[PDB]
Amino acid sequence: EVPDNPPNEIYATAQQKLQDGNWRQAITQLEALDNRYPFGPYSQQVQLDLIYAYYKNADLPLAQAAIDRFIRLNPTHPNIDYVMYMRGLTNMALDDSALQGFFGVDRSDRDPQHARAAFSDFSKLVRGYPNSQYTTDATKRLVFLKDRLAKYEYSVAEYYTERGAWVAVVNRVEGMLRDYPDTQATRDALPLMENAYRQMQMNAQAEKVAKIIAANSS
């Protein structure tokens, strides 16, 4: 780290390596300010810069620790709307970050444990700060984060359909129908619960879906 200096001597050197993007040297600086002044004049905005430095340096629990620090430090702040965005933004990075993106592989057949967390914080942003500069951003994420659950819930509804566990087809597909009407994974799962019924001899109950198939054909 950097020893006990003036707070801005640590900070302006930290402010360089954020502008330089040298987060591993910025985190070498930014903690060294809060090593000596965690109450200091920058230490409130160090944490925001730390969530800026850590998450850019893939220190994602450390960013989220710096969030929960700043949650415990400043339960309100002019940059909690930053932080409540930054919670879900790290949580989106917490969810799906594999190298298979350049090879063209879906990662919403993969566990959205942290997109679920990102669904919370982005919605806690657009509720708790419904007009911030991050609110307009995180609102559209949430609809796609709904779709990220949708393709994930389609991935298992795919699985049970080819499994032919038509009870488990129904309960998964009804879960999609509890969750969202809007994605195409709604209307593509729509005949599959209808498929489950004819396979479970609930043809008349499949006709009730066939009405919805008729009504939500368009």
């Binding site: 933004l89 990075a93 007009n131 991050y134 609102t139 919805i212 368009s218």
Partner: protein
């Protein structure tokens, strides 16, 4: 390490977020309607403005 690695950053993907879910909403007949927002799905469509994604700036 001690070398030119030529990558250090960590961002959250693209704006497929801003390429958000399509519209295939409930038009089901009578006796066929059921709740479709159950879950964490509480998204107030709040376009209180400000930049987005890579244009959105964070520190």
């Amino acid at each position: 390490c001690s070398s030119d690695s030529r990558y250090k950053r960590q961002v959250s993907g693209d704006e497929a977020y801003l390429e958000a879910a399509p519209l295939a909403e409930l038009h089901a007949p009578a006796g066929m309607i059921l709740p479709v927002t159950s879950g964490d799905y509480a998204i107030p469509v709040t376009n209180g403005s400000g930049a987005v994604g890579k244009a959105l700036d964070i520190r």
